[PDB]
Amino acid sequence: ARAFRLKSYADGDLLRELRQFDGAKNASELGPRAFVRDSHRLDAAVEKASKLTDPTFHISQYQLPHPYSFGGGPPNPERPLTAPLISAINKVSQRTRDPVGYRKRAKESIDLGDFTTHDPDTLHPRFLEYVHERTRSVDGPTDDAMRAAQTVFARLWRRKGCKVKARSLSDAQPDNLLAIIKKGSPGEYRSLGAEDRRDPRLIATMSSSLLRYASAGVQVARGRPPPGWVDTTTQVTLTFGKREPKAAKIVDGVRQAPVPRFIFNLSPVNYALASFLHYDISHFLMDNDPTHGPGFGPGRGRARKFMDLVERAFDGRFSTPDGARLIMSDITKWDANMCEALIKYSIDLLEDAVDKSALSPEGLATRGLMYRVARRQLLEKLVEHPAGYFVKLYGCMPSGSFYTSLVNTTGNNLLVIGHAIARAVEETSLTHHGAAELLADAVDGTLISYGDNQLFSEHLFSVLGLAYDPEKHAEFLARFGMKLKVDETEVTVKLGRVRFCSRSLVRTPHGLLITRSHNSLFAKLAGRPRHDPVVDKLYVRAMMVDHMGTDPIVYAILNEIDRSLNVSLEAAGLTDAAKKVLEDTAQSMFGNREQDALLAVYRALSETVIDRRALLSLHTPRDMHLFTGELTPAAQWAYECTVEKWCQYLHDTDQEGVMFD
């Protein structure tokens, strides 16, 4: 495809120039669920950016003769699991403490549970959240505290033994590339006939798109100019809108169906540039950085960093020993309001961690050009809006980039260390260096973020002689274009309201135990659409694994649903829907969606019954077999726990907060 330039420059002129191109098909699609172009999906967003002095979004002057976008539509109306769910709730609820209150609280989740799918006609209103004012930089004192915070994490990573080195171009040959690549969507190369990132023909294109930087770098070390493409090469991103269970909202008396969350599909060429540069720093933070959420998993010991934080702040008690509180930041539309200012701090910090020091003059120069492009493509993306036309987007962080967890996590962490350095400087006699020194000792074990998901102990602000102010905190993130909902930012001292990534922790007599709200289940089961009754049986069993049989109410409920689906999971076929269920469970429990993990999960779920003892064996730390034989002393306590002793215990220990919300 060769692009053509349009006449105008203003978004309102460019909009009207686009109506003449409407009705075009994707051309890789026949039927009614195909894609058509509709410039009117832009109307709302163009209008919103008229009133902005620096909008995040511009219509691109270059357009293609056919869209690349895919069509689609709504999902199965049928919700075959909520019938057994309400029935089984009725049976189990009787055994709880308040059986009519349990039923009331469940109907809220069950009645508001839906499912979202890719459909460009449902998707375009989501893009309006990404249309706001840009924030290319911040003011004096903010930048001071922010760079002060980068040196907090500079020190943390070195103390946690960062020894990360830049790869050589050796590792860009096809077979060495295969190492750092992971099974994903092949982007705009799905039109040449590909379906994964690990196609042997794609791995070629990726390997070329990395070596091409060598010529340039050689040039740049002869004091010559690099090629022009180093400053221009832009790749096309595609938009999607994810298939996930998402909840309806009852705004003003109507059941507003859920607006699909936004997905990007970065060219595998961008994926290789990111992987080559920042894979080794990601998988270092994953393994050794107490504040790096990503890689978090509910079971098999993959929740170490969540529990460390909590067992440091609670020292065996059900409420903190000091007054010191826990903070759980609710930031609205993180992915849409991730600005340029913060993306810059986060990815620059991540590139520092890499040791360039073993690099040739040509090699240094070459990595320099790779990083220049990667940084640029991180700050300004060429996206095909679900109208079918191309759009310039200046810096957001939607899911589907290699960087989405890496950069959003590093960003939320810099925000709170940055906010706290900025308070310390203005409110006490601490210097910038003075505060950054105290926090580098403090933050090991008192902060953890997984994108917008954030949990930290007030001990952070204590070693500065301050108390956490959710009001001064929202002001700081105001400086970056982020809205901290002070009403929903949970501050507490009660173990039962401490929550990271939807998971709670309940102190049993012999140890801590991970768990999940009852809402989440009842809304996911209420939203699951009709699949082959086998794949739906697998779903219930994937849920059962998710909850690691901690709650005997949840196990009782799920066991009923499971039994009500009278099919045989034995020798079930790897349909595509069944492989989806296995892949997800193998990501949360193993970390890899690899074969020998998919098999471990397949063998586990395709047994005649899944008993609570097995599920509780997910608690006991590992590192194939999903389940083991040994229960932790705390798991074994929960095994001997009935629905009635559970409801008693949570009531006596003031831990009923783990059951709802």
DSSP string, 387-451: TSSEEEE-S---BTBTTHHHHHHHHHHHHHHHHHHHHHHHHSS--HHHHHHHHHHHSTTTEEEET
Question: Residue 260 belongs to what H/E stretch?
Answer: none
Beta bridge partners of 62: 5
- Cα dihedral value 178, 183, 185, 187, nearest 10: -10
Distance CA 147, CA 432 (A): 10
3-state secondary structure of 347: helix
Distance CA 655, CA 645 (A): 13
How many other β-carbons are positioned within 10 Å of the β-carbon of residue 235? Answer: 18
CA angle (579 as vertex; 527, 206 as ends), nearest 5: 110
244-247/113-116 β-pairing:
antiparallel
Q: Choose among 386, 283, 310: nearest CA to 658.
A: 310
3-state secondary structure of 650: helix
Instruction: State the DSSP code for 640.
Output: T
Beta bridge partners of 113: 247
Question: Residue 384 belongs to what H/E stretch?
Answer: strand 381-384
Q: Are 616 and 631 in contact (CB under 8 A)?
A: yes
Spell out the SS3 assignment of 452-468: CEEEEECHHHHCCCCCC
CA 439 to the chain's CA centroid: 26
Q: Which residues of 587-606 are buried (b: 16+ CB within 10 A; e: fewer)?
A: ebbbbebbeebbebbbebbb
How many other β-carbons are positioned within 10 Å of the β-carbon of residue 256? Answer: 11
Distance CA 592, CA 586 (A): 6
**Å resolution of this model?**
3.4
Contact partners, residue 475, CB within 8 Å, separation at least 6:
none
Distance CA 169, CA 134 (A): 36
Distance CA 588, CA 300 (A): 9
Angle at which helix 552-564 crosses helix 82-93, to 10 degrees, equals 140
Q: Which residues of 342-369 are buried (b: 16+ CB within 10 A; e: fewer)?
A: bbbbbbebbbbbbeeeebeebbbbbbbb
The experimental technique behind this entry is X-ray
How many other β-carbons are positioned within 10 Å of the β-carbon of residue 566? Answer: 8
CA angle (587 as vertex; 518, 632 as ends), nearest 5: 65
Distance CA 211, CA 223 (A): 20
Helices vs. strands in the chain: H and E counts, helices first? 26, 18
Q: Are 269 and 205 in contact (CB under 8 A)?
A: yes
Angstrom distances, CA of residue 226 to CA of 211, 363, 368: 14, 14, 11
Phi and psi at 151, nearest 5°, equal -75, -20
Which tokens go with 126?
């989501």
Contact partners, residue 405, CB within 8 Å, separation at least 6:
293, 294, 450, 451
CA 32 to the chain's CA centroid: 33
Q: Are 421 and 142 in contact (CB under 8 A)?
A: no
> Sheet harboring 381-384: ordered strands across?
57-59, 390-393, 381-384, 236-239, 264-265
Which tokens go with 434?
């003075």
Which tokens go with 638?
């929960």
Contacts 24+ apart (CB under 8 A), 175-182: 177/203, 177/206, 177/207, 177/210, 177/272, 177/275, 177/276, 178/203, 180/275, 180/276, 180/279, 181/206, 181/268, 181/271, 181/272, 181/275
Q: Are 347 and 523 in contact (CB under 8 A)?
A: no
Ramachandran area for residue 610 (φ above 0: left; ψ -120 to 50: alpha; else beta): beta
- Cβ-in-10-Å burial (0-12, 13-18, 19+) of 271 comes to buried
Contact partners, residue 188, CB within 8 Å, separation at least 6:
68, 235, 236, 238, 267
Q: Are 457 and 326 in contact (CB under 8 A)?
A: yes
Q: Are 17 and 7 in contact (CB under 8 A)?
A: yes
Q: Are 171 and 163 in contact (CB under 8 A)?
A: no
3-state secondary structure of 119: coil
Angle at which helix 518-527 crosses helix 552-564, to 10 degrees, equals 20
3-state secondary structure of 94: coil
CA 425 to the chain's CA centroid: 33
Q: Are 518 and 643 in contact (CB under 8 A)?
A: no
Beta bridge partners of 484: 331
Distance CA 137, CA 342 (A): 8
Q: Are 57 and 131 in contact (CB under 8 A)?
A: yes
Q: Choose among 584, 628, 622: nearest CA to 602.
A: 584
Phi and psi at 245, nearest 5°, equal -70, 120
Which amino acid, one-letter code, is at 4? F
